[PDB]
């Protein structure tokens, strides 16, 4: 395979998804140059699990899965196995046995505008925590109280999604970060994604 993995399509997307409606890109039948990623002076975060950034280009996998979205800075720590918080519980959950890398970069200059950018949403309320890689996009009014809501917003009856309102003057923990999770799948099957041999 001379096919080069279309990382560009993911990292340089221009449009990025809200965390609640996170995107997935399947990556198969190409050679992956992880060098392009770990050499970039953009990534404030590069946490790898069951695998090492150095080791990446010398490793072979069945498939790779790139999940991408936007969150607050303070929430970058939650995109990890065995975490809790509004994001890990209600938006995007990694499993305990997760194999892959979590890469994040500050996108204040892109995803912030004066007066606040209210486009990026997250789920604030859910009846229960997400199972790993579950993706909930429903907008059922959430029953906080004892009264049934009947799909009407009001007291104790909240719309489950909230805006971030990223403004450029915020502290980093409240600035937007773009996140890409690379999942490395390893089945008892021939590998389709390898580093430069």
């Amino acid at each position, epitope marked *: 395979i001379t096919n080069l993995c279309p990382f560009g399509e993911v990292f340089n997307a221009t449009r990025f998804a809200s965390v609640y409606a996170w995107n997935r890109k399947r990556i198969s039948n190409c050679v992956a140059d992880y060098s392009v990623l*770990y*050499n*970039s*002076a*953009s*990534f*404030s*975060t*590069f*946490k*790898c*699990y069951g*695998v*090492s*950034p*150095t080791k990446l280009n010398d490793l072979c996998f069945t498939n790779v899965y790139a999940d991408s979205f936007v969150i607050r*800075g*303070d929430e*970058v*720590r939650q995109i*990890a196995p065995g975490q809790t*918080g509004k994001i890990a519980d209600y938006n995007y959950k990694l499993p305990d046995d997760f194999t892959g*890398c*979590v890469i994040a970069w500050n996108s204040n200059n892109l995803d912030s505008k004066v007066g606040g950018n209210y486009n990026y949403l997250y789920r604030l309320f859910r009846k229960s925590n997400l199972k790993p890689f579950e993706r909930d996009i429903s907008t059922e009014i959430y029953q906080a109280g004892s009264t049934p809501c009947n799909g009407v917003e009001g007291f104790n009856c909240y719309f489950p999604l909230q805006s971030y309102g990223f403004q450029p003057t915020n*502290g*980093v*923990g*409240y600035q937007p970060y773009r996140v890409v999770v690379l999942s490395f799948e390893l089945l008892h099957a021939p590998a389709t994604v390898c580093g430069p041999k």
Partner: antibody
Amino acid sequence: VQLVQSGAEVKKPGSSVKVSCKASGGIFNTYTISWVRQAPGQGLEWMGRIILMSGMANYAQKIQGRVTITADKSTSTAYMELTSLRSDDTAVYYCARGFNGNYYGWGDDDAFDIWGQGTLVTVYS
Amino acid sequence: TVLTQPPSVSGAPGQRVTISCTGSNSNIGAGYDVHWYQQLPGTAPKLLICGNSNRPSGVPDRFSGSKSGTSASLAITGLQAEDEADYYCQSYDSSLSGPNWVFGGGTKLTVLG
């Protein structure tokens, strides 16, 4: 895994000093270098971090514009240049690498696990 | 930015002391890991506690860390002469326009002789 820093420096005010820090072992678990300074009989102050693979550097608000941190990926050496020196720049300057026992790589939760022996920089008038 | 430690703590051989670390919602309160450091007289700092309560190999059992709310705490049981040092707590801070790693003021621990 050793961090070996360059020898002590005696400088005059308004001068420049470039301290060194070499790693010994491998990049196999060394991804970031941070500089932390300590004025005599005082606490520790984080100064800056460099990401070894990418050379992206982040500096403390206190020394922004007076410090640059570079690295040489071939020699596994990081550098810390402090310009326009002042009396209260007199301190021991420590290099340290980021570590976390949860993941391989770099993150916000990185603790300094291995330290250099220290470089005392004296700004002498 | 700074974390708030007591400047001084004392104990007799065999006793148990604690050192508190107070921050805000930009650091400990945000959920950032707290790391503890031990600096003996004329030596470089040593990682004592990483990630709230976990100990590196070669750090005695009697050291332990805990985190709760905006506060962290280090506990030394059955302290001895070797324990007389400066103790620093450390976490991350996200208040400013850039990444920020942040130390406490330090706590002088006297083993009472």
